[PDB]
PDB file of all heavy atoms in Angstrom:
ATOM      1  N   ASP A  11     105.308 139.310 117.639  1.00  7.99           N
ATOM      2  CA  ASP A  11     104.138 140.030 117.197  1.00  7.99           C
ATOM      3  C   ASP A  11     103.765 139.498 115.809  1.00  7.99           C
ATOM      4  O   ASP A  11     104.416 139.836 114.841  1.00  7.99           O
ATOM      5  CB  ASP A  11     104.399 141.540 117.192  1.00  7.99           C
ATOM      6  CG  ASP A  11     103.125 142.298 116.650  1.00  7.99           C
ATOM      7  OD1 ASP A  11     102.033 141.986 117.124  1.00  7.99           O
ATOM      8  OD2 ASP A  11     103.286 143.111 115.772  1.00  7.99           O
ATOM      9  N   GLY A  13     101.574 139.907 112.938  1.00  7.04           N
ATOM     10  CA  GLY A  13     100.622 140.787 112.270  1.00  7.04           C
ATOM     11  C   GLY A  13     100.023 140.148 111.077  1.00  7.04           C
ATOM     12  O   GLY A  13     100.421 139.049 110.629  1.00  7.04           O
ATOM     13  N   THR A  14      99.012 140.838 110.427  1.00  9.96           N
ATOM     14  CA  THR A  14      98.363 140.350 109.182  1.00  9.96           C
ATOM     15  C   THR A  14      99.354 140.462 108.038  1.00  9.96           C
ATOM     16  O   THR A  14      99.394 139.596 107.159  1.00  9.96           O
ATOM     17  CB  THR A  14      97.194 141.233 108.877  1.00  9.96           C
ATOM     18  OG1 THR A  14      96.209 140.982 109.831  1.00  9.96           O
ATOM     19  CG2 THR A  14      96.560 140.910 107.506  1.00  9.96           C
ATOM     20  N   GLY A  15     100.197 141.509 107.964  1.00 10.31           N
ATOM     21  CA  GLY A  15     101.167 141.740 106.960  1.00 10.31           C
ATOM     22  C   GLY A  15     102.510 141.146 107.385  1.00 10.31           C
ATOM     23  O   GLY A  15     103.070 140.383 106.642  1.00 10.31           O
ATOM     24  N   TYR A  16     102.971 141.494 108.524  1.00 10.80           N
ATOM     25  CA  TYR A  16     104.316 141.238 109.060  1.00 10.80           C
ATOM     26  C   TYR A  16     104.349 140.602 110.455  1.00 10.80           C
ATOM     27  O   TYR A  16     103.643 141.017 111.405  1.00 10.80           O
ATOM     28  CB  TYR A  16     105.150 142.436 109.032  1.00 10.80           C
ATOM     29  CG  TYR A  16     105.428 143.014 107.684  1.00 10.80           C
ATOM     30  CD1 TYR A  16     104.454 143.830 106.996  1.00 10.80           C
ATOM     31  CD2 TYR A  16     106.601 142.679 106.984  1.00 10.80           C
ATOM     32  CE1 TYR A  16     104.606 144.234 105.700  1.00 10.80           C
ATOM     33  CE2 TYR A  16     106.759 143.060 105.619  1.00 10.80           C
ATOM     34  CZ  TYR A  16     105.767 143.793 105.005  1.00 10.80           C
ATOM     35  OH  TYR A  16     105.929 144.238 103.750  1.00 10.80           O
ATOM     36  N   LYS A  18     107.006 140.187 113.590  1.00  6.41           N
ATOM     37  CA  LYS A  18     108.173 140.724 114.201  1.00  6.41           C
ATOM     38  C   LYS A  18     108.630 139.799 115.281  1.00  6.41           C
ATOM     39  O   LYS A  18     107.830 139.579 116.225  1.00  6.41           O
ATOM     40  CB  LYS A  18     108.013 142.144 114.697  1.00  6.41           C
ATOM     41  CG  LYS A  18     107.331 143.089 113.674  1.00  6.41           C
ATOM     42  CD  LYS A  18     105.829 143.113 113.914  1.00  6.41           C
ATOM     43  CE  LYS A  18     104.995 143.783 112.796  1.00  6.41           C
ATOM     44  NZ  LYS A  18     103.606 143.380 112.977  1.00  6.41           N
ATOM     45  N   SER A 186      97.406 150.913 113.332  1.00  2.00           N
ATOM     46  CA  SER A 186      97.019 150.662 111.959  1.00  2.00           C
ATOM     47  C   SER A 186      98.108 149.872 111.263  1.00  2.00           C
ATOM     48  O   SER A 186      99.154 150.377 110.914  1.00  2.00           O
ATOM     49  CB  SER A 186      96.648 151.926 111.232  1.00  2.00           C
ATOM     50  OG  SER A 186      96.072 151.614 109.960  1.00  2.00           O
ATOM     51  N   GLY A 187      97.872 148.551 111.081  1.00  2.00           N
ATOM     52  CA  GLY A 187      98.843 147.650 110.453  1.00  2.00           C
ATOM     53  C   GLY A 187      98.513 147.350 109.040  1.00  2.00           C
ATOM     54  O   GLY A 187      98.046 148.196 108.286  1.00  2.00           O
ATOM     55  N   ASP A 188      98.688 146.072 108.616  1.00  2.00           N
ATOM     56  CA  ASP A 188      98.241 145.673 107.298  1.00  2.00           C
ATOM     57  C   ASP A 188      96.697 145.309 107.275  1.00  2.00           C
ATOM     58  O   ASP A 188      96.080 145.570 106.257  1.00  2.00           O
ATOM     59  CB  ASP A 188      99.057 144.461 106.883  1.00  2.00           C
ATOM     60  CG  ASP A 188      99.195 144.292 105.357  1.00  2.00           C
ATOM     61  OD1 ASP A 188      99.288 145.318 104.699  1.00  2.00           O
ATOM     62  OD2 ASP A 188      99.069 143.143 104.852  1.00  2.00           O
ATOM     63  N   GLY A 189      96.176 144.711 108.313  1.00  2.00           N
ATOM     64  CA  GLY A 189      94.844 144.045 108.228  1.00  2.00           C
ATOM     65  C   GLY A 189      93.711 144.708 108.876  1.00  2.00           C
ATOM     66  O   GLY A 189      92.565 144.593 108.415  1.00  2.00           O
ATOM     67  N   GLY A 213      96.466 148.805 105.990  1.00  2.00           N
ATOM     68  CA  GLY A 213      97.434 148.898 104.985  1.00  2.00           C
ATOM     69  C   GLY A 213      97.243 148.025 103.713  1.00  2.00           C
ATOM     70  O   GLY A 213      97.651 148.426 102.648  1.00  2.00           O
ATOM     71  N   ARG A 214      96.528 146.890 103.822  1.00  2.00           N
ATOM     72  CA  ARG A 214      96.235 145.971 102.683  1.00  2.00           C
ATOM     73  C   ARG A 214      95.097 146.490 101.803  1.00  2.00           C
ATOM     74  O   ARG A 214      95.230 146.426 100.589  1.00  2.00           O
ATOM     75  CB  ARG A 214      95.894 144.623 103.285  1.00  2.00           C
ATOM     76  CG  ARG A 214      95.841 143.380 102.294  1.00  2.00           C
ATOM     77  CD  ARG A 214      97.210 143.090 101.724  1.00  2.00           C
ATOM     78  NE  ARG A 214      97.407 141.656 101.432  1.00  2.00           N
ATOM     79  CZ  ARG A 214      98.219 140.852 101.998  1.00  2.00           C
ATOM     80  NH1 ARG A 214      98.994 141.125 102.997  1.00  2.00           N
ATOM     81  NH2 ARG A 214      98.228 139.616 101.576  1.00  2.00           N
TER      82      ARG A 214
HETATM   83  N1  LIG F 401     106.163 154.282 105.100  1.00115.76           N
HETATM   84  C1  LIG F 401     104.995 153.659 105.061  1.00115.76           C
HETATM   85  N2  LIG F 401     103.966 154.409 104.682  1.00115.76           N
HETATM   86  C2  LIG F 401     102.776 153.841 104.617  1.00115.76           C
HETATM   87  N3  LIG F 401     102.495 152.541 104.899  1.00115.76           N
HETATM   88  C3  LIG F 401     103.566 151.831 105.253  1.00115.76           C
HETATM   89  C4  LIG F 401     104.779 152.334 105.397  1.00115.76           C
HETATM   90  N4  LIG F 401     105.753 151.409 105.764  1.00115.76           N
HETATM   91  C5  LIG F 401     105.000 150.298 105.882  1.00115.76           C
HETATM   92  N5  LIG F 401     103.673 150.500 105.564  1.00115.76           N
HETATM   93  C6  LIG F 401     102.579 149.549 105.516  1.00115.76           C
HETATM   94  O1  LIG F 401     102.249 149.076 106.883  1.00115.76           O
HETATM   95  C7  LIG F 401     101.645 147.800 106.854  1.00115.76           C
HETATM   96  C8  LIG F 401     102.405 146.863 107.752  1.00115.76           C
HETATM   97  O2  LIG F 401     102.336 147.423 109.068  1.00115.76           O
HETATM   98  P1  LIG F 401     102.469 146.392 110.321  1.00115.76           P
HETATM   99  O3  LIG F 401     102.419 147.256 111.592  1.00115.76           O
HETATM  100  O4  LIG F 401     103.730 145.632 110.329  1.00115.76           O
HETATM  101  O5  LIG F 401     101.169 145.626 110.030  1.00115.76           O
HETATM  102  P2  LIG F 401     100.743 144.326 110.753  1.00115.76           P
HETATM  103  O6  LIG F 401     101.134 144.309 112.186  1.00115.76           O
HETATM  104  O7  LIG F 401      99.294 144.324 110.949  1.00115.76           O
HETATM  105  O8  LIG F 401     101.130 143.104 110.040  1.00115.76           O
HETATM  106  C9  LIG F 401     101.681 147.344 105.359  1.00115.76           C
HETATM  107  O9  LIG F 401     100.454 147.623 104.686  1.00115.76           O
HETATM  108  C10 LIG F 401     102.845 148.239 104.826  1.00115.76           C
HETATM  109  O10 LIG F 401     102.864 148.258 103.410  1.00115.76           O
END
Side-chain angles (χ1 to χ4, degrees):
Chain A
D11 180 47
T14 295
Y16 294 83
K18 313 94 193 164
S186 190
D188 205 43
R214 195 65 150 244

